Amino acid sequence: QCDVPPNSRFDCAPDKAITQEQCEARGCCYIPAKQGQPWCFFPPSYPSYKLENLSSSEMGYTATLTRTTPTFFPKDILTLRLDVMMETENRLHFTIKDPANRRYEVPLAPSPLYSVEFSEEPFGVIVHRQLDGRVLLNTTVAPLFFADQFLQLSTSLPSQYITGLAEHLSPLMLSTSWTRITLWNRDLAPTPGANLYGSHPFYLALEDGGSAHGVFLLNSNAMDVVLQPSPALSWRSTGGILDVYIFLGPEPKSVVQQYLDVVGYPFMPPYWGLGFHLCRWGYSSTAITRQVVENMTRAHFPLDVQWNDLDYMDSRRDFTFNKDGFRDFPAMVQELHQGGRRYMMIVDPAISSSGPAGSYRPYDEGLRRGVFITNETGQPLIGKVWPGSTAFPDFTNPTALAWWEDMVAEFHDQVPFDGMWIDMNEPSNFIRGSEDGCPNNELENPPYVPGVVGGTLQAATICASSHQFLSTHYNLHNLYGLTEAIASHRALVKARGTRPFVISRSTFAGHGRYAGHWTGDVWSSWEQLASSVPEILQFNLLGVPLVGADVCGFLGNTSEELCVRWTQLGAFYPFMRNHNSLLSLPQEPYSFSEPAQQAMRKALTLRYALLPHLYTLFHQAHVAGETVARPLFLEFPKDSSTWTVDHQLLWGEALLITPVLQAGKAEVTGYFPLGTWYDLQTVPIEREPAIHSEGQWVTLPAPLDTINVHLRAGYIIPLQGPGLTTTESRQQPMALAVALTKGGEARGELFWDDGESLEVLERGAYTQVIFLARNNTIVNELVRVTSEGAGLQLQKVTVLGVATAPQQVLSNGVPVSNFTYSPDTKVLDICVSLLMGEQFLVSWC
Ligand SMILES: *[C@@H]1O[C@H](CO)[C@@H](O[C@@H]2O[C@H](CO)[C@@H](O[C@@H]3O[C@H](CO)[C@@H](O)[C@H](O)[C@@H]3O)[C@H](O)[C@H]2NC(C)=O)[C@H](O)[C@H]1NC(C)=O
Ligand SMILES: *[C@@H]1O[C@H](CO[C@@H]2O[C@@H](C)[C@@H](O)[C@@H](O)[C@@H]2O)[C@@H](O[C@@H]2O[C@H](CO)[C@@H](O)[C@H](O)[C@H]2NC(C)=O)[C@H](O)[C@H]1NC(C)=O
Ligand SMILES: *[C@@H]1O[C@H](CO[C@@H]2O[C@@H](C)[C@@H](O)[C@@H](O)[C@@H]2O)[C@@H](O[C@@H]2O[C@H](CO)[C@@H](O)[C@H](O)[C@H]2NC(C)=O)[C@H](O)[C@H]1NC(C)=O
Ligand SMILES: *[C@@H]1O[C@H](CO)[C@@H](O[C@@H]2O[C@H](CO)[C@@H](O)[C@H](O)[C@H]2NC(C)=O)[C@H](O)[C@H]1NC(C)=O
Ligand SMILES: *[C@@H]1O[C@H](CO)[C@@H](O[C@@H]2O[C@H](CO)[C@@H](O)[C@H](O)[C@H]2NC(C)=O)[C@H](O)[C@H]1NC(C)=O
Ligand SMILES: OC[C@@]1(CCC2CCCCC2)NC[C@H](O)[C@@H](O)[C@@H]1O
Ligand SMILES: [Cl-]
Ligand SMILES: [Cl-]
Ligand SMILES: [Cl-]
């Protein structure tokens, strides 16, 4: 009864410090660890629920679950309903709910890849992969708890390899050594072990052999997820229901895709959103802000988007501008547009409530329309943020959405900003709960407090029992940032009539359908640089591919060498912004020594060259639920060596980036999956040429002015000529980079539209082209050709891995005007005059 192997003990006192006597009185086993592992744990006989009246339907199954013995938590729900829905061959879905009470729920050969079976007593759901018989879910392993404010469901895991459960600063692969992962959106500088800005209750689990599955728990309550070495996992939520989805893959990429079929495919950003953004707190005037642009331009540094932080505001209030430094804010932004750039600025959620009545429209209308989160007496809950006393909009209230749209649209008529930087949307509060504290009820003081920093649900936020239109804050807290992202997205669509650009701090599952994300107040340090790679990858797995960290870091002072290395790696973040704190030394690219400016300019130049490629990868995310930046294991799951790699990334299938992440290094050791990898340095953009890998670690030269980038054999990459903006670069001629397999083959693609309109795919207003290398030929294949894309000029074709100097190079049957062959590098560089949207044939021999 108490003979349970150590790694398999499930905690019977998750709620408090317990003595042996109390442990044994709960009906549990007490065995001290010899050195965490729980001392108090459930014997296999501990009372759970019993399955009864299991029944079949066309959709799947239903059953009643009955608990006859209470747990140690209050308000056990003794009778539950089980519903199992076999929704697709790839997707299994089950819920457990109270049949007598509607509980809070988040507002969201032919055969399945899975089979399901049930344990009767104690109750459990067992899900096998049909193909190899492997056990993916087994909830029999621990008791089911289902109490008003405490849900626990556990499972065995099929391996020690699991990723997901944002937002935390951790390796891509989570530790299963008694790790407690807390999902409660919290304003805090990224650090290991803490609940951070967002919550994504989703994991992907690898299985021996390289298949994988995913599990989503659709639950927005504060929760702990506890992983143990057996290996196993327990969800512990503080409310709601169990709403579980299992995605059968079998490939890691399909798991991600199947997960996004439920939560939403990522939104398609405007092309301009993919250029360089530059911001700091401290650009304290329009004159200083104009100087940033001027300084970048004179030093030939590309810049698509200038930003402002709090600086622009009048006394730190949304939807105003001060009349000292920012008197001519409208003219600055118009000027920006005149030069072919965009403008972004910070918006906070909380609205100043202390102004004289009649003098501040956002609050005054807010009041009239009842848009704000309210307290016990029905009055606005007042906290403290930048402007002082503030009320907090309820983005679940339809009237609040309408009010948000008005404020954005009215401010947009004054200053034509191109998107919104939504910060502080945990929501963050400078004080605990409210100016008036919080009441004493079960929501503020719950029977189980997850492991949140501050040890309370109110720390750095508003009262848990405060009222919103759809429910209490207790239930909705983890959706705050999400709901604001939805509101802002809609607001920007209505105000501007083109694709919105929303960058949000706080997020939830499903966020990437509406907005992007930056990882928050990271320190300017080597460790945070290194940590940003797993974090960027994680968000990509979670369907938020528009993500990055503050290039060169946010807090403290960057160094020149750190900024060089941060810029090199950061140019490979899908969302690329250098942002800096109030107190920090300047870190704009132009503020450094000449050799460092050169390395930084080179990294920006390579990013801009690759923008057509990066844009196509976002197209694949948007229509097929693909990742943009992806870990090696997503692309080479069968090579088990890739499983723990999180300090390299891929862009899509073909581009392997291997950064230096340490001070004083002039080399880097990177893993190279089986195949040939061409050094991108061999492609002309306005040391071994090829790595021939068996699946091995390779040491690469990486002096300060270099980041290592290789192109997988078998792939063709579209590139475009230079510009300091995408307005410029989009008008330039294009080039292909063709990486031949040894057998002379390669494939690639280009998606092209106008860069910003809505409904492009639905209206068919794009061009899609495929490129094929075969038998010493390169042709294009025209999937779709329209006015947008038809006049793209192809001026250059570079072929990697051509073994012998050719005697003739033809374009459409005519000797080209010039080519080079380099016998050292195996590169054939061809000048051409062709159109992306008209069929061509380039041959050599
Ligand atoms: C719900 O929220 C409202 C604000 O919307 C809270 O109203 C606040 O209540 C306190 C008293 O409990 C007021 O404090 C008093 O201020 C006056 C005049 O300035 C002072 O002379 C008194 O001695 C006292 O400090 C406070 O002014 C008022 N806030 C506002 C903005 O009017 C209300 O208390 C909240 N209800 C609960 C139960 O939290
Ligand atoms: C398990 O189900 C039995 C039988 O319920 C009937 O069949 C079902 C498919 C559904 O149509 C029910 O509404 C039917 O009542 C339940 O046993 C019955 O208990 C009821 C009410 O307490 C009583 O009228 C009958 O005498 C019982 N019938 C028999 C044949 O035993 C039972 O409660 C269900 N178990 C649980 C825990 O829900
Ligand atoms: C980040 O740097 C500032 C300034 O550091 C000084 O000036 C630089 C150009 C560089 O040469 C440094 O080595 C200098 O020492 C720090 O802010 C300073 O704080 C100290 C007290 O701690 C104060 O006496 C200085 O005058 C401040 N300087 C100014 C002008 O703001 C700051 O502490 C650094 N941040 C961290 C976290 O280390
Ligand atoms: C699901 O997990 C349960 C509990 O860990 C496993 O059930 C135990 O299995 C062994 C061998 O069958 C027995 O000695 C115990 O009696 C079982 N426990 C219970 C409570 O029945 C079970 O093997 C797992 N199922 C699968 C398919 O792996
Ligand atoms: C933009 O660049 C200009 C030129 O480098 C900067 O202005 C100089 O700043 C230094 C401070 O280190 C002063 O000694 C000089 O008075 C300024 N020189 C000139 C040419 O006027 C300016 O600080 C930069 N602005 C921004 C916003 O980066
Ligand atoms: O708007 C101001 C800031 C920073 C404020 C905060 C001040 C004290 C120390 C930490 C930074 N909001 C929080 C955001 O994360 C940050 O980017 C933004 O610059
Ligand atoms: Cl004791
Ligand atoms: Cl509710
Ligand atoms: Cl290895």
Please work out, in degrees rounded to the nearest 5, the angle formed at the alpha carbon of residue 212 by the alpha carbons of 215 and 49.
40
Ligand nearest to the CA of 133: 4
Contacts of 247 (CB under 8 A, 6+ apart): 90, 91, 213, 214, 215, 216, 254, 255, 258, 259
Alpha helix ranges (H) inside 228-377: 252-263, 286-298, 329-338, 361-369
Ligand in nearest proximity to the CA of 287: 5
User: What is the amino acid identity at position 180?
Assistant: R
How far from chain centre, in Å, is Cα 298?
34
Q: CB count, 10 Å around CB of 66?
A: 15
Question: Taking the CB of residue 630, how many other CB atoms lie within 10 A of it?
Answer: 22
Orientation of helix 361-369 relative to helix 398-414, angle to 10°: 160
Could you tell me which residues are annotated as the binding site?
A: 309, 505, 521, 579
Which phi and psi (to 5°) does residue 534 adopt? Answer: -55, -30
- Long-range contacts, 331-339 (Cβ 8 Å, 24+): 331/286, 332/286, 332/289, 332/290, 333/415, 333/416, 333/417, 334/416, 335/290, 336/293, 336/306, 337/416, 339/293, 339/725
User: From CA 811, how far away is CA 212, in angstroms rounded?
Assistant: 45
Distance 212 CA to ligand 9 centre (A): 20
**Closest to 462 measured CA to CA, from 436, 442, 483:** 436
Experimental method: X-ray
Q: How far apart are CA 790 and CA 842, in angstroms?
A: 19
3-state helix, strand, coil in the chain (%, to 5): 20, 30, 50
User: What tokens were used for 620?
Assistant: 């694949």
Residue 397: strand, helix, or coil: coil
How close is the Cα of 41 to the center of ligand 4, in Å? 17
The answer to whether position 770 is within a domain reads: yes
What is the 464 CA–ligand 1 centroid distance (Å)?
A: 19
Q: Tell me whether residue 55 is in a domain.
A: no
Long-range contacts for 765-770 (Cβ within 8 Å, ≥24 apart)? 767/792, 767/836, 767/837, 769/836, 769/837
Q: What is the per-residue DSSP string for 303-334?
A: -SEEEE-GGGSBTTBTT---SSTTTTHHHHHH
Whether 167 contacts 276, CB under 8 Å: no
Q: Quick check: is 404 in a domain?
A: yes
DSSP H helix total and E strand total for the chain: 16, 48
Please give the Cα distance from 489 to 305 (Å, whole number). Answer: 18
Peptide bond into 167 cis (omega under 30): yes
Torsion sign, CA atoms 633, 636, 637, 639: negative
Rounded Cα distance between 845 and 840, Å, is: 17
On whether residue 200 sits in a domain, the answer given is no
In a domain, 749, yes or no: yes
> What is the total residue count of the chain?
845
Closest CA to 843 of 806, 798, 811, 805: 811
Q: Supply φ then ψ for residue 241, to 5 degrees.
A: -125, 170
The Cα 672–Cα 713 span in angstroms is: 12
Residue 408 in domain: yes
Residue 838: phi and psi, rounded to 5, are -125, 135
Instruction: Assess whether the C-beta atom of 581 lies below 6 angstroms from ligand 6.
Output: yes
Q: Is residue 720 part of a domain?
A: no
Asked if residues 522 and 536 have their Cβ atoms less than 8 Å apart, the reply is: no
Pairing of strands 841-844, 777-784: antiparallel
Report the number of distinct structural domains present in the chain.
Answer: 3
Resolution in A: 2.2
Looking at residue 51, its amino acid is L
* Residues lying with their CB under 5 A of ligand 8, a single-atom ion: 104, 471
Q: What's 26's domain CATH number?
A: 4.10.110.10
CB-hemisphere CA count at 13 Å for 643? Answer: 18
Structure tokens at 567: 């810029």
Q: Whole-angstrom Cα distance, residue 512 to residue 355?
A: 36
HSE-up of 331 (CA within 13 Å, CB side)?
7
What's the CA gap between 766 and 762, in Å, rounded? 10
Determine whether the shortest distance from the Cβ of 582 to ligand 3 is under 6 A.
no
Residue 773: its H or E element: strand 767-774
Q: Whose CA is nearest to atom 34 of ligand 1?
A: 436
Annotated binding site for substrate: 309, 505, 521, 579
CB 501 within 8 A of CB 270: yes
CA distance 432 to 384: 9
Report how far ligand 1's centroid is from the alpha carbon of 182 (Å): 34
Sign of CA dihedral 700, 706, 709, 713: negative
Q: Which ligand is nearest to the CA of 671?
A: 9
* Rounded (10°) CA dihedral 484, 489, 494, 495: 80
- Exposed / middle / buried, residue 336 (Cβ in 10 Å: 0-12, 13-18, 19+): buried
Strand bridging mode 135-138 / 123-129: antiparallel
Tell which one of 284, 288, 291, 311 to mutate to probe ligand 5, the residue whose CB is within 8 A of the most ligand atoms: 291
DSSP assignment letter at 267: P
Q: Which active-site residues does the annotation give?
A: 423, 426
Count of C-beta atoms within a 10 Å radius of residue 39: 19
Strand partners, 389: 384
Strand order in the sheet with 576-578: 547-548, 516-518, 502-504, 420-422, 342-347, 305-308, 276-278, 576-578
Largest CA distance in the chain: 91
3 state DSSP class of 437:
coil
> In terms of C-beta density within 10 A (0-12 exposed, 13-18 middle, 19 or more buried), how is residue 6 classed?
middle
Tokens at 89, concatenated: 């061959």
Kindly state the tokens that stand for 467: 């009222």
Q: Ligand 3: distance of its center to the CA of 192 in Å?
A: 27
Lining ligand 1 with CB less than 6 A are 375-377, 379-382, 436
Q: Which atom of ligand 1 lies nearest, measured to the CA of 379?
A: 5
CB 517 within 8 A of CB 539: yes
Amino acid present at 100:
A
CATH number, domain at 808?
A: 2.60.40.1180
Q: Determine whether the shortest distance from the Cβ of 557 to ligand 3 is under 6 A.
A: yes
- Residue labelled with tokens 């307290």: 375
Strand partners, 480: none
Q: Whose CA is nearest to atom 1 of ligand 3?
A: 557
Q: Are strands 305-308 and 276-278 parallel, antiparallel or unpaired?
A: parallel
**Boundaries of domain holding 11:** 6-41
Q: Is 435 inside a domain boundary?
A: yes
User: E strands of 637-766, at which residues?
Assistant: 649-651, 655-658, 667-672, 675-679, 690-693, 696-701, 708-712, 715-720, 734-739, 746-752
